Amino acid sequence: MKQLLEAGVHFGHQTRRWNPKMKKYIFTERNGIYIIDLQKTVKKVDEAYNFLKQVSEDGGQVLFVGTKKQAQESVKSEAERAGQFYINQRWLGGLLTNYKTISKRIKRISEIEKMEEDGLFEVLPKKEVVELKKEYDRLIKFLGGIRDMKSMPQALFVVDPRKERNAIAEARKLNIPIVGIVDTNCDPDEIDYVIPANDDAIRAVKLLTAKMADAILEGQQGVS
Template sequence: MNCETVALGSFCELKSRRGKKQKGEILMAVISMKQLLEAGVHFGHQTRRWNPKMAKYIFTERNGIHVIDLQQTVKYADQAYDFMRDAAANDAVVLFVGTKKQAADAVAEEAVRSGQYFINHRWLGGTLTNWGTIQKRIARLKEIKRMEEDGTFEVLPKKEVALLNKQRARLEKFLGGIEDMPRIPDVMYVVDPHKEQIAVKEAKKLGIPVVAMVDTNTDPDDIDVIIPANDDAIRAVKLITAKLADAIIEGRQGEDAAAVEAEFVASEAQADSIEEIVEVVEGDNA
């Protein structure tokens, strides 16, 4: 476990700051088994593509596909929610990372909704470890925007304006989501750390804790807060990412962002048992 001290405080202290269940109190999961099943969070990769280190998070295998143990997903999603909420309460800067097409929209939307930052196109090597250079490119992006706003474009040759617009578009594509990020992030949330290996390595080098959706083909060792989940389905990515954004909002505002979903009570969540997973996976090979 990574116990490096970061700007938001001790990672280990934050991760262990979970509320104790009081006598007679019913604690409700932030995501129900039913929601996970409906979003297809349980579908892993083909068995031949698995990473053996994910064995303890796998429930079974059906037709050559590993099925993720959703009881563990519920548990680890709760831990991730608590960690993200506590980090946000300590004014953490959170960077959402997901550059594949299934994740790009959700990563951008939920980062913006929670007042945080994102990278949803190609990760540029050195984004964190060479932050000074990245800041210079961001400054250039802001400079080009100012040139358009103050009328400079109107007095420049059309060819030069076209080149500036092309440069701005490229900078916005890769850096627009971190244009206003005040510093290196305190926490990184990653969709598919197998694909985002460079980003994860940079975070680990700098002692930045990583929260991630981890599928059955991924090495979980470098991830501090794991959420075993299908990271290829758009609905699954949206569900998990939105819940973590809710956690950030709750931490920053002191509000329960999940209150609107309080209608599903703990008893209903418990009814969605491991038997339901068996029923679903045996009848659905998607």
């Protein structure tokens, strides 16, 4: 669970062009923005605390997709706290449905390291080595933070989903469920696995992504 009184600056909107499928979740209108109702926020948090726990006991991973500034460091620091994978910087266009040709680029972060022990340092000329170093820095940069993605992940977690439109577009087209902190203009109303909360600060991302980082933790310990 969580608490309404834990939410200090964990409520509000960026109101200017809200979506009116988020008319049910507002509390009132205070100071320009639509502040968001916290009786149903904590209830959808504990419903997601059941849902991330109960489905993941047979080889179950989460994908922590947070690409937004002041939402990437929460996933970056809390995914390997949880022990899972994530994508903090540059979600790819095509990483879930396009896995048959990004299996080449989930392996070529390991390929380079299958050349460092058995001959890389200037046995080739100088215009291959620093270029392959730039390929390593870009494939630890633009890939995300995933390394052991063996299959398609059976769960997924998007953080700021109004900007990550192709993150929901590959999870909807592989019938894997989404968990999103739905801000204003998020089109999920049809799926009851969202979090009606606020992503505008480090703490407002952080305290509602940390519970879904530790939510699966309680899915490991007790039934495996």
